[PDB]
Design a binder for this molecule. Structure first.
Ligand SMILES: Nc1ncnc2c1ncn2[C@@H]1O[C@H](CSCC[C@H](N)C(=O)O)[C@@H](O)[C@H]1O
Length: 272
């Protein structure tokens, strides 16, 4: 039922999703402050510049760092992050994606194949808590992406997932996380502290943690996706797209009030 509830969330025609969240189908917000972004900044542009800023903060614009031989994308959505990483790391011959959504994985497979990446990118129906089942234990991960996923995890699944992940990360390896955390510890009519503590308790060293994108940039992404749904589905969106259209206002209000932020959380497995 856990996986059924996530399958329902991300089900529906990817071609419909494109009209709402952009052609790249990236679904963890974006940054609007990149000097390379020419206004008006699209959801696609905001989303990929946000990911590029995360990789910059994780040290991947420095050439004096180890070769990236193996990549994991935990909760790989509609597969654009894996496609981007295959082009950014053209000598990386193994990029693994895990997802519980069969419809997203079926789209990922077709999208990657179209781009000649079917043999470099491996896609698994695999819950983050079962990552011990990923093949080739001899090849640790140099780079792990967890972009807008852990919000779907009960605390126990988050802890077990990070415990499972840690042993499979190469010492010196980077885990690049984006999640939507609460700044307020009360019921009003995961916190940064708890979120960070799970990673450090696991044995990861904190490398960089910050609000990113800014509250106003997350609000802009949400209100732009809302405008997209209202323009492209004037007669009514349904399921997750209608929920997104409604959540956009309430979440944007929470963001302006600083009740919630999106955090860039980059940890490393220590070279010990
Ligand atoms: N327990 C779990 N194990 C694996 N993937 C999960 C998961 N719970 C949620 N997911 C996946 O996490 C994703 C959340 S949406 C984010 C998608 C992508 N990382 C992006 O940045 O666009 C979805 O693809 C969802 O199916």
């Amino acid at each position: 039922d856990y996986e059924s509830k996530i399958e329902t969330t991300y089900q529906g025609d990817p071609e419909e999703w494109r009209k709402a969240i952009g052609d790249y189908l990236l679904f963890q917000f974006g940054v609007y402050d990149d000097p390379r972004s020419t206004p008006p900044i699209s959801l696609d542009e905001a989303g990929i510049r946000y990911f590029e800023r995360q990789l910059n903060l994780a040290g991947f614009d420095d050439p004096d760092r180890p070769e990236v031989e193996r990549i994991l994308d935990i909760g790989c959505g509609w597969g654009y992050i894996l496609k981007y990483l295959a082009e950014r790391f053209p000598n990386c011959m193994r990029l693994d994606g895990i997802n519980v959504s069969r419809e997203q994985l079926e789209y990922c497979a077709r999208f990657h194949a179209k781009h000649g990446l079917a043999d470099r990118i491996n896609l698994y129906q695999c819950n983050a808590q079962d990552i011990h089942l990923l093949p080739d234990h001899a090849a640790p991960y140099d780079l792990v992406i967890i972009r807008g996923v852990i919000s779907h995890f009960p605390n126990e699944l988050y802890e077990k997932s990070m415990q499972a992940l840690y042993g499979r990360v190469r010492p010196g390896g980077m885990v690049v996380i984006s999640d939507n955390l609460y700044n307020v510890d009360l019921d009003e009519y995961k916190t940064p502290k708890y979120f960070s503590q799970v990673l450090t308790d696991t044995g990861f060293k904190m490398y960089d943690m910050r609000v990113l994108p800014s509250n106003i940039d997350v609000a802009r992404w949400l209100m732009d996706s809302k405008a997209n749904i209202e323009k492209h589905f004037p007669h009514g969106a349904t399921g997750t797209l209608e929920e997104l259209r409604v959540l956009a206002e309430n979440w944007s209000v929470a963001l302006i009030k600083n009740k919630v932020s999106t955090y860039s959380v980059i940890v490393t497995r220590p070279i010990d």
